[PDB]
Amino acid sequence: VGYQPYRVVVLSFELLHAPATVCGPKKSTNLVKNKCVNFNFNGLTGTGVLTESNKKFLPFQQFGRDIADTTDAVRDPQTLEILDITPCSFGGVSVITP
Amino acid sequence: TPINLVRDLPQGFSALEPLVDLPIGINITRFQTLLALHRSYLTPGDSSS
Numbered sequence: 680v681g682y683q684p685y686r687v688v689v690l691s692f693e694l695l696h697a698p699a700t701v702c703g704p705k706k707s708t709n710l711v712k713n714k715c716v717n718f719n720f721n722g723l724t725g726t727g728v729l730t731e732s733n734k735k736f737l738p739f740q741q742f743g744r745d746i747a748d749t750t751d752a753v754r755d756p757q758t759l760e761i762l763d764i765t766p767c768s769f770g771g772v773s774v775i776t777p
Numbered sequence: 778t779p780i781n782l783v784r785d786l787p788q789g790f791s792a793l794e795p796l797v798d799l800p801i802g803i804n805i806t807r808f809q810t811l812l813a814l815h816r817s818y819l820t821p822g823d824s825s826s
């Protein structure tokens with residue numbers, strides 16, 4: 680048994696100044712929309728709803744900004760759909776007194 | 778972009794959409810282009826003159 684031939688394959692992993700071109704199988708949780716949830720699409724940890732937009736993005740674009748220079752439109756990679764980013768809700772409690 | 782002209786390129790506007798991205802990360806300072814030539818029955822077939 681020790682004299683039978685064996686095939687040996689050695690895997691080597693190195694890190695350089697070149698960016699990552701190989702990645703292990705990326706996990707992807709289910710996409711929930713129209714709810715105040717938190718997402719991280721590789722460039723920002725944004726919290727807000729994900730509505731369905733009507734504006735098409737050119738087939739090289741992953742991010743998106745507005746007039747006020749805020750990231751409010753990000754393309755989902757797996758489904759290549761365009762989803763907007765909106766803050767959930769905020770405000771104050773005003774009262775009226777007789 | 779199609780055009781019907783030889784020289785003195787038109788003043789029209791045409792943005793350049795990007796193409797496939799190459800994440801190489803190497804060293805670069807010089808470049809050169811490649812051309813193609815034909816060898817018909819008129820030419821003898823030698824790349825001298």
Ligand SMILES: *[C@@H]1O[C@H](CO)[C@@H](O)[C@H](O)[C@H]1NC(C)=O
Nearest residue numbers: 704707755756757758759760
């Ligand atoms: C994402 O990858 C899966 C297979 O892993 C494929 O079925 C799906 O069509 C892909 N979506 C794209 C390329 O938008």
Ligand SMILES: *[C@@H]1O[C@H](CO)[C@@H](O)[C@H](O)[C@H]1NC(C)=O
Nearest residue numbers: 695696697802803804805806
């Ligand atoms: C790229 O070239 C510069 C100068 O030519 C050098 O300092 C640098 O180390 C090179 N990068 C790599 C990854 O070799």
